[PDB]
């Protein structure tokens, strides 16, 4: 189960049709400077580590 | 900490007043399982029988049991206060009785049909199956009839 530990460095903003999720910019620690922009469910903030079961995705939006 | 092995003196089942009764339980609640008697009177007469309540039923003696039922069918001889009883001041004698497994429903039907034949309110309510104790009957409790 090779996962990637990457840290939210920016929060783009809330989405879901019901404010239930967000979009964030996350930098991979392994292979530093490799950025991504991805989604999150729960309460989160700056500097925040998070495991990711993949690297290769950027969901633009959602309702 | 007391541990001891129950042998053939034990018995999984027995009979008391037209009713089978279970061992492997507290004797007093076996008695409550018998009709015409609940926890109060059962505990009371077991104390009067002068016997362990902690102990189960199957490992008991017929002398214990006949003494018990003797208390039950002649309690006032055994100094019961005459208010535990389920029938105080009977209508025909004024004596305070305790009805048992069969006599409970027997005398129940007796005084009920007595009311019915004297054409009483309570009797006809019992007859038609309505509520007897002055309940509200419109909304709640339709599912007994």
């Amino acid at each position: 189960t090779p996962v990637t530990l990457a840290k939210v460095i920016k929060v783009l903003g809330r989405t879901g049709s019901r404010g239930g999720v967000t979009q964030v910019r996350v930098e991979f620690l392994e292979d530093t400077s490799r950025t991504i922009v991805r989604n999150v469910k729960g309460p989160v903030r700056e500097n925040d580590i998070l495991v990711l079961m993949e690297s290769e995705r950027e969901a633009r939006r959602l309702r | 900490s007391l541990v001891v092995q129950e042998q053939g003196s034990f018995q999984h089942i027995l009979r008391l007043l037209n009713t089978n009764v279970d061992g492997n339980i507290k004797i007093v609640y076996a008695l409550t399982t018998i009709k015409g008697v609940g926890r109060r009177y059962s505990n009371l007469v077991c104390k009067k029988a002068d016997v362990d309540l902690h102990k189960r039923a199957g490992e008991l003696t017929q002398e214990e049991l006949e003494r018990i039922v003797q208390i039950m069918q002649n309690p006032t001889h055994y100094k019961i206060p005459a208010w535990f009883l389920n029938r105080q001041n009977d209508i025909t004698d004024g004596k305070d009785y305790h009805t048992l497994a069969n006599n409970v429903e027997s005398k129940l039907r007796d005084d009920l049909e007595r009311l019915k034949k004297i054409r009483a309110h309570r009797g006809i309510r019992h007859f038609w199956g309505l509520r007897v104790r002055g309940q509200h009957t419109k909304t709640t409790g339709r599912r007994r009839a």
């Binding site: 996962v3 530990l5 879901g16 049709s17 239930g20 999720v21 991805r38 989604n39 999150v40 469910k41 729960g42 309460p43 989160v44 903030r45 925040d48 580590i49 998070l50 495991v51 990711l52 079961m53 995705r57 969901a59 959602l62 309702r63 | -």
Partner: protein, 206 residues
């Protein structure tokens, strides 16, 4: 250490806990370093307490519940399902019995193995709804560390709760076995099975 006396004599074990080191009643909150650098900063250790109860106004702000002591959160999660609203005292009693059970078992730090269990059973990816209009659809997304924490504690508590419902195995011992199951990875704990089931459907609807 010196065993000090007073006008009122005190038991020596508690005198020792005072003079020496802050603990549980017994256990040492140290050497409970967790393995997940994701879940660090959203757990709470190195703030030791004897008891697992205090009315810290943690839920006024957003992440002060992250700064809350974790075992207090466990107790607060244990007291639920209506009839057991409140009764935090019996909650901490059950905690006491469970931790003693774990440490007579799994004789390392039971605090350590429970934190290993919650990080074992952390759900990492979830799914969420899109409405459509006429028809609903799913989409798999990521999960907060704090949400991993809350979901895992809820999972453990509820699995042990329904294990205890209408049966003889008490909540304390069913909770302890559930916790060590989640610690090792058992395929028997409610928490881990629901976690990887949910992550599996997430993987599916990616």
């Amino acid at each position: 250490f010196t065993p000090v006396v007073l006008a009122t004599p005190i038991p020596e074990e508690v005198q020792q806990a005072q003079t020496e080191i802050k603990l549980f009643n017994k256990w040492s909150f140290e050497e409970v370093e967790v393995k997940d650098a994701s879940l660090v900063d959203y757990v709470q250790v190195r703030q030791p307490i004897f008891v697992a109860h205090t009315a810290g106004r943690y839920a006024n702000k957003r992440f002060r519940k992250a700064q809350c002591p974790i075992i207090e959160r466990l107790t607060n999660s244990l007291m639920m399902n209506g009839r057991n609203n409140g009764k935090k005292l019996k909650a901490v009693r059950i905690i006491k019995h469970t931790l003693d059970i774990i440490n007579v078992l799994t004789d390392q730090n039971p605090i350590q193995v429970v934190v290993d269990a919650i990080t074992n059973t952390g759900p990492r990816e979830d799914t969420t709804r899109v409405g459509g209009g006429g028809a609903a659809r799913r989409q798999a997304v990521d999960v907060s560390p704090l949400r991993r924490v809350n979901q895992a504690i809820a999972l453990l508590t509820i699995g042990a709760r329904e294990a205890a419902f209408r049966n003889i195995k008490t909540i304390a011992e069913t909770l302890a076995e559930e916790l060590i199951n989640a610690a090792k990875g058992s395929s028997t704990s409610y928490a881990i099975k629901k976690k990887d089931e949910l992550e599996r459907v997430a993987k599916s609807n990616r």
